[PDB]
Every structure is written in structure tokens, then in C-alpha cells.
From Swiss-Prot:
<protein>
    <recommendedName>
        <fullName>Endothiapepsin</fullName>
        <ecNumber>3.4.23.22</ecNumber>
    </recommendedName>
</protein>
<keyword id="KW-0378">Hydrolase</keyword>
<dbReference type="GO" id="GO:0004190">
    <property type="term" value="F:aspartic-type endopeptidase activity"/>
</dbReference>
<keyword id="KW-0732">Signal</keyword>
<feature type="disulfide bond">
    <location>
        <begin position="255"/>
        <end position="290"/>
    </location>
</feature>
<comment type="similarity">
    <text>Belongs to the peptidase A1 family.</text>
</comment>
<feature type="active site">
    <location>
        <position position="199"/>
    </location>
</feature>
<feature type="domain" description="Peptidase A1">
    <location>
        <begin position="17"/>
        <end position="328"/>
    </location>
</feature>
<keyword id="KW-0645">Protease</keyword>
<dbReference type="GO" id="GO:0006508">
    <property type="term" value="P:proteolysis"/>
</dbReference>
<feature type="active site">
    <location>
        <position position="35"/>
    </location>
</feature>
<keyword id="KW-0064">Aspartyl protease</keyword>
<keyword id="KW-1015">Disulfide bond</keyword>
<keyword id="KW-0865">Zymogen</keyword>
Length: 330
């Protein structure tokens, strides 16, 4: 089997991407944030505290003939950005782009933090990291990908995120028309439960490539590119007037600037992030200070190849017995 679904930015900045997901019988379609940095599939639901729902579409398990309460199971998750959610668990039929999993754990939110409430466009998350990170207790549950894997034509999914445009998540096949050149594969460590890999270095604009190992995670659920302070300083030093602002919470730059590209290494291959991808617009409405898309990972504890980086590539998440990651230009 295979699946193919379009993923769409939630706003003009590509702050996140939503992908329609069919849950239950008859289908209830919710728009979920596919997150290769976490491993829970959770949804706004009929159980979510009323005051914490503001415009989201909810899953109502009582209206699904295939829903079953997973007795005694609870979940609770905290994300890198400080947001969180928790609740109980159903199993139900879940389909993405024509690919169907029966008996998928669907984690129903009883509580969500303010940032989830305040984002009316995201109806929940669909985790695509390794199932070892799944938070369901007392019996850990499998991700949608883990459940689908055996049935897939090939044990892979791909992320093809658009810049200010829709893109695609495919399951079970590699669309050879979706990228240019060849796909360069690189080793993955699953020791922390992430799609963790080591970039071979970077360049800023038309500058020379610096060969240096940068360990980090491929994380579709993180907006920006978070890298070591040395790398980030080298980038922003090429933008007149750019500076790190503790009050704003990172590097800002004059909105009048033309940003240089940023290149990262994948083995001997190179992925180029155009400068425009690094512009996250005014810090507040009407400001001439703009927020940067490359930020320091210092104090996160991990480097994160988030959407800014991933949307510059066609990315293969290869879930074979020994997982690997592939990157192609597009």
C-alpha cells in the first residue's frame, strides 16, 4: 500500500503545515501537524475542556462506530516550545492520503496549553518520530507510520514541504519526479528516539564551505533551523544590522535586508536554503525589525533541522531495519 496527502502552510510565514487526516467511521477529517520530532497522534476532541477549544475541528469518538476506549490509558506531552497537552486514548481507524491503519491509538485531549488553543488551524499532531518516544501510559503505543510500515510497498515516508506553498507527505514510495538530481542518504541514530543525523558542514551565501560535523534532528514540527551559536553568528554577521535580541528571543534583522542563502551538507551533497526562506517577518505588526529563521540551539540541548531547512529539500525518512535519512534538492 501507499498514501499521498497534501500538506499546507497554516499562515503566510509557514509557521507550521497541516495535513488532512480521516479518523473514525464515518470519517471525521481533522487537519493535523505532522511532526517527525514527536511520537503521539493526539487530537482536539469532544473531551477537550470547552474553554480551551477556539475554532478547532474536534474528534468525537462517540460518533465513530470503530472507536474503542483504550481502557486505563492516559497520555501527557510537553514540547520543546513549552506547549503541552494531555488526555485519554481511543483506538480507531485512521487514514492519510488513502493509506489506512486500523487500531491506531488516537490520543484524545482533555487539556491543551494556550498556544494550541490560540491556533485555530491545528486540530492536533501526528507524530512520526520513533515509537519509543510515545507518551501513552501504562502501555506505550505505536505511531501511524510504525503501524502502517509492514503494509507499505517500501518502509518509508517522504516530506516535501513547500515554501509559501503546499507540499506533500507520501507513505510507502519515493516519487522520483519530486526532486532533482540524486538522493543522498545519511546515517541515523535512534538512540534519543529522533531522526537524528550528522550534517557535514555549512556555508553562508556564496562563502566557502566549512567542513564540520553538526549532529541534529530532522523535525517537521519545528518551524526554524536551530544550530550551534558559532554557526548562527557566522550567518547573521553577513546581514547588516542583524543582532541577537534577548528581549525578542533571538536574532532579528532589518526588514529592508536581503538575506544570504545558507547551505548545509549531507555527506558530500549540499542543500541550499534560499535567503527568503530565512525571513519570518516583522517581530510585531508594523515593525521594521524582522525575525530570523536561523537561531541558536544553545540551551535547547540539540540542533534542530526544522521546516526552514527541510522545505529546501525532498526528505526521505527510511524506516528500514536500520533507518536512514535521504535528502535531495528539488
Amino acid at each position: 500500500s501507499t498514501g499521498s496527502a497534501t500538506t499546507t502552510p497554516i499562515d503566510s510565514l509557514d509557521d507550521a503545515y497541516i495535513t488532512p487526516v480521516q479518523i473514525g467511521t464515518p470519517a471525521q477529517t481533522l487537519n493535523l501537524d505532522f511532526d517527525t520530532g514527536s511520537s503521539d497522534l493526539w487530537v482536539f476532541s469532544s473531551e477537550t475542556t470547552a474553554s480551551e477549544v477556539d475554532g478547532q475541528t474536534i474528534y468525537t469518538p462517540s460518533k465513530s462506530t470503530t472507536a474503542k476506549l483504550l481502557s486505563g490509558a492516559t497520555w501527557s506531552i510537553s514540547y520543546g516550545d513549552g506547549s503541552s497537552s494531555s488526555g485519554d486514548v481511543y483506538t480507531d481507524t485512521v487514514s492519510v492520503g488513502g493509506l489506512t491503519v486500523t487500531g491506531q491509538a488516537v490520543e484524545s485531549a482533555k487539556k491543551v496549553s494556550s498556544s494550541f488553543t490560540e491556533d485555530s488551524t491545528i486540530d492536533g499532531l501526528l507524530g512520526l518520530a520513533f515509537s519509543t518516544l510515545n507518551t501513552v501510559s501504562p502501555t506505550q503505543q505505536k505511531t501511524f507510520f510504525d503501524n502502517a510500515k509492514a503494509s507499505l510497498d517500501s518502509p518509508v515516508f517522504t516530506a516535501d514541504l513547500g515554501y509559501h506553498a503546499p507540499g506533500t507527505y507520501n507513505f510507502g514510495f519515493i516519487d522520483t519526479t519530486a526532486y532533482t538530481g540524486s538522493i543522498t542518504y545519511t546515517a541515523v541514530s535512534t538512540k534519543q528516539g529522533f531522526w537524528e543525523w550528522t550534517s557535514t558542514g555549512y556555508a553562508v551565501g556564496s562563502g566557502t564551505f566549512k567542513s564540520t560535523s553538526i549532529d541534529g534532528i530532522a523535525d517537521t514540527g519545528t518551524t526554524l533551523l536551530y544550530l550551534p551559536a558559532t554557526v548562527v553568528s557566522a550567518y547573521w554577521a553577513q546581514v547588516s544590522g542583524a543582532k541577537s535580541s534577548s528581549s525578542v528571543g533571538g536574532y532579528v534583522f532589518p526588514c529592508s535586508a536581503t538575506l544570504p542563502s545558507f547551505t548545509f551538507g549531507v555527506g558530500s551533497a549540499r542543500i541550499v536554503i534560499p535567503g527568503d526562506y530565512i525571513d519570518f517577518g516583522p517581530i510585531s505588526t508594523g515593525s521594521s525589525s524582522c525575525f530570523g529563521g536561523i537561531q541558536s540551539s544553545a540551551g535547547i540541548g540539540i540542533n534542530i533541522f526544522g521546516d526552514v531547512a527541510l522545505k529546501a529539500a525532498f526528505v526521505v525518512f527510511n524506516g528500514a531495519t536500520t533507518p536512514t535519512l535521504g535528502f535531495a534538492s528539488k
